[PDB]
């Protein structure tokens, strides 16, 4: 079973406001063992096993001056099948915060499944 | 109706029994016997010995501590009697148990001996300590009493010791004796230990 | 910081369904 | 019509005796049906 | 002090007025399914709070099974206060009540 | 600290307090101290012994 | 067990004198004193308590709030186990100007 | 300045009678500052503020005055003030708690907590506790709970723990009554150390902790309970209280050694300390009511004690043991048939338990049980044989190492035989907790430095 | 619910009444005057809906009890209404009494003897005596006052005798007998009384006509038209449509409720009035509004967005209108237009509190009133009192199993490691619980938590086998504290194979669809296993059905 998520950084900013946010990792501040799931760009390694609580992406917002992460949360663990980086349009120029992440959830026949 | 509503409040704060000065001693008798009625919990560990329960649980932490209802310090209890939940000859009584928990609750009758000192009462105490702003005393060498600098007469003059502590001198010009007689100005309950605020001027 | 007689030590850990102090107690 | 029955109750200056299963549930009292149709008392030996 | 003595007198007078004497009691000599359930539950609750047990619990760890054993030997020290629709009651001991 | 198993639900004076003589207080103290001596209650008896001592002697 | 015990069972303070769960509050004590559950409705403002001979308050009857106001009385409070929705209901009924009086035994 | 400040405050107080409360608060805030900030009110001005406030404390006993007072009680490191100034602070506190004995609760708490500080830095705190315990005996209540509240945890710094006991000892020396809560704290804490040490058997830490604590406790006891102090003193009372508390916690103490020794050691200071405490153990042993496990634990204690002690009478010990053994003849008589009757030999755990202890005691003190003639005290030669051949067959149901050692020694002493009874036994050849309970001996040798040296006078090493 | 925490006091009965303005002013923790809720920076504004005197809010301590957001129960406040308002719930009633009263003698337009007849019948009905209330109608002698006063005397004599006679026996108590049939007879009379009250046009006491009062959907009363024949008698009264303010209505009812106090005493009391309280007209009016504690008016947080309080929107609007109208009436002192907007403000404040309480009876989506809050869908009583979401419960698809007992349920190990029972530690079960404590919260049969006798909880979740082993050897230790010596430690142990569970298959059409099953933890299971004998009672077919497990 494949599930796709859209991680958009345009959630608060509107009408071309200056952005405090950016895909990747901020300098000086770095909480322990996050590099195990995400690559240098802050995006996850395609193929990595993820459980609820694990970091699914990484960013830095200047308003809080802290390195934050968007957590993966579901009862079913998954693997990363596809990560797409998307241009923000809006007269271009701005870096691509935005991003579509596809999860591959393996489903063996369990006691309860209908046939 | 203008004074009828206020009349109920006066009777709520009215001193039930006043302490009388007797036997030409000059001191007012404050120890009194008052029969009371309690509603106490009974632990299941005390289900075979209930009187020991009511005693160890609620009556023992009550002694040598001020109880707001009796208006004094519980010096002890005498003649504990459990009220049977069943109106009836035997020593086997019954107590109602809470539907939710295994604990039972019962009415009890016991006589309390309390130290009830109201204001205006004349009491004697042994001087514990004597600072420049207060005099420490002990009523019956167990109850704390204090006379503040303003409650001490104007004629009296304190003298601080340089060697090592101080001493107060009365109007005549001589140091104050071990025991001192004072009037009750106020009684402080709210705190840890009962403290009597005393006066030496009236 | 919790503020309980106990001492938290910081580094509070979130457990899904249970938020506990890294140390002594859990809300 | 919760507010309507409440209005009629207030105007009557009514006392809810808490004897109906519903009323008992409202005030967190044990239901008077079955196991709640009696009281349990403990026999204690000491006078 | 004076107003409480009257209140206590009324409380105990009403209690006595409601109590049905041991001879005048006219309910079932049998312990109802509900009475048994509550007795076993309440006694189990007492057993779990270190209450003196009147039976030999031969390796029993469940307080309800202990309360069941105490019932079998009629050693449960409880009384059922059977209420009637007027508020009057009949006090029946666990011992005297017939159990199936 | 201040629970149903620690403190009572209600306390009510069944009658007005009746004053007791110095000899009655001392007779009660002797009766109470002897019965209790026969865990935190010990510190209260220690204080009660001081009152009994004051009602007949000097500290 | 379902509709109370393992749902919204709350041991709540109630004033026996006026029968309410919303007027009761924990008093703010001094450095050495202990906090006591007091009823805002039945307690009288210290200054307003005015006076056969003069009477004196037994000290145990005077309690203070967070604002520093002294009160006399309103100490006839106890504890009752109730569902929390009752507290929310009583609160809502009070907005409408309706008063619920809980007759609590023993008195 | 000097007189300007006298004005500033005198104004502030006028302003307070008017409720403006600003001036005071400015002052309070100034005194509340930390010991570090240079801008905290200086000594000379504080001398002034204090002496003015003390002179009419009633001016401040108001809701408006609360904050100021709170700020002075919470004055950092006041014990670090100056003489003259220190004196004004003390007089103020004295004055304050006199009228509204409500702040003594706050002051003493901080005092007790300072008990973690050396034998010196607390004098003022104790001086004050002694004073107000006397004048306000009712305070003992909440201040006892403070004793609880502020105890340092086992994890907390050693200096904190070692201090908070140093102070409690100091407190003990001017408030004899309060005693119990203290002793409860020490006991509660020492059990924590003993229990943990066992389970664990950082550790280098608990060693020197638990070591520093016990060595202290026992030296204070070597002093505090003393013959002089035992006839006319509170040494005897202390001993009784301590013994009861100790037994009770230890009595039910579970599989752990590190505190029970405190009693092993104080005991052997004086003949009577041994006597009475030992008689308490005898009272424990043979009560009908006690847990099949309590009687067995005591019997282990009993046997270990007699074996190891040093300040013993040979004879006060032995005769009681002989009486217990005669106690033994009765047990078997009122029970073997209880033996050939329905049940198992486990019905008699407690019998073997006691017989073990006695056998064990005989191993270590054997050479003693031969009187001048060369005869055996308690007819041990004739006695052991009788039990060994009884229907209980002790040899089969008791330990696996004591029974062996008793065999060896008993055989050597012509006291009793057994290698054939053993042969027969392993030819014929909830049960675990019992084997567990019978393996623990609460007075098997100790493992600690100083204490060890201190115990030597009271201990018999196997060698 | 804790068995270690018993309760000594109990609620025996609930009394329904109206809060008086004087009562609210005394109990109030703070007077709310400001329509703003927050100051700049983010602190609650003094005199606003989020004032700290109403309880702890925004990591600040309560300014009344001093406690934090957890322990603070919250405190009631009050809004001082500049003019009295009609209470929406009791408007219909005050309207009935306004139309039924004479504007001259200030008595009900119905003859005093007829009114007394209802007061008599309603007094006898406070006690369980219906037969006597009908027997009163038999007591019989344009009619002279000396004769009618004798009829009132004879009727009062029968009422006093019939009550005393029944009071002597066990027919009625001092508190009065109250049954459904008694209630039916009371409801019939109170209806008949108001019907007779409203029917009379010309006052039977003083023959002068009163001007008829008309009403609209919203709480507002006004004057009526009047033909020439009605005019000809309003002028001979002395010889022998316009809006009416809330104050005028209150003042009319004030005198009428004083003059007719005897009948209203029994009209408003179901059982005898032992409290001897006066039945005042100001009960139907609101001179103040109680401000519920901040605790029940907290702003709803959905993810990141913190919504403004639903209640604080309409309540602040009422405060804006209140402050605007009290100032727009204050500048009028230094004086048409000012009267026009004054009246228009008097209307929008009554409609503001009407909107504060209800909708369908407002406007014509508006903000829901407190009536709407109690009847949102099924209602607060149905959705949160008669029915509730519960703790210690699980849900799963049922799977068939013939190897378990017909009285058992196959519990998956997933549920077994989460569902715990508070088992108090004793001498008889110290062995069983020590193992559970060592095992911990992930090994079955284990324990998720341990409750000490002091009342505190120790979670075993984060702990390793070493700490668990230490706590297990500390379970049966005697309590040093005398205040908790009665108590013993508790172990929140995993659900074992000896436990009871309530199995439920919805819809629960009959009590057989909610039975008690014996727990049987089956390893490597992800579904609830049920025996075939249970299929009938639950009316459950293993077609992917779901069942609720209650512990
Ligand atoms: Zn009240
Ligand atoms: Zn509050
Ligand atoms: Zn008229």
Numbering used by the authors:
A (entry chain B): 803 to 917
B (entry chain G): 8 to 95, 99 to 174, 214 to 251
C (entry chain U): 9 to 35
D (entry chain A): 1617 to 1663
E (entry chain F): 55 to 154
F (entry chain D): 12 to 49, 80 to 100
G (entry chain B): 1090 to 1140, 1148 to 1203
H (entry chain O): 48 to 248, 324 to 551, 581 to 614
Direct quotes from the study:
Here, we present the model of a yeast Pol I PIC in complex with CF, Rrn3, and a transcription scaffold resolved to 4.4 Å using single‐particle cryo‐electron microscopy (cryo‐EM). The model includes the DNA‐bound Pol I‐Rrn3 complex (Engel et al, 2016; Pilsl et al, 2016), downstream and upstream DNA, the Rrn7 N‐terminal Zn‐ribbon (B‐linker and B‐reader are not resolved), the Rrn7 cyclin domains, most of the Rrn11 TPR domain, and the Rrn6 β‐propeller domain. In addition, we observed several helical densities throughout the CF‐upstream DNA region, including the DNA binding helical bundle (DBHB), which we were unable to unambiguously assign to a specific CF subunit. The cryo‐EM density reveals almost the entire path for the downstream and upstream DNA, although clear density for the single‐stranded open DNA region is missing. The upstream promoter DNA is bound by CF approximately from base pair (bp) ~−40 to ~−16 immediately upstream of the region bound by Pol I. The position of CF on the promoter DNA agrees with previously published data showing that CF interacts with the “core” promoter region (mapped to bp −38 to +5; Kulkens et al, 1991; Meier & Thoma, 2005). In the Pol II PIC, the upstream DNA is bound outside of the cleft by several transcription factors (Murakami et al, 2015; He et al, 2016; Plaschka et al, 2016), whereas in the Pol I PIC, the upstream DNA is positioned closer to the wall and protrusion domains. In contrast, in the Pol I PIC, both Rrn7 cyclin domains are located farther away from Pol I and do not directly contact Pol I. Direct interactions with Pol I are precluded in the Pol I initiation complex since the corresponding position of the N‐terminal cyclin domain near the wall in Pol II is occupied by upstream DNA in our model. Despite its different position, the N‐terminal cyclin domain of Rrn7 also uses this interface. The DBHB contacts the DNA backbone opposite to the minor groove that is close to the Rrn7 cyclin domains. Together, Rrn7 and the DBHB promote bending of the DNA by ~35° around position ~−30 and likely contribute to maintaining the upstream end of the transcription bubble next to the protrusion.
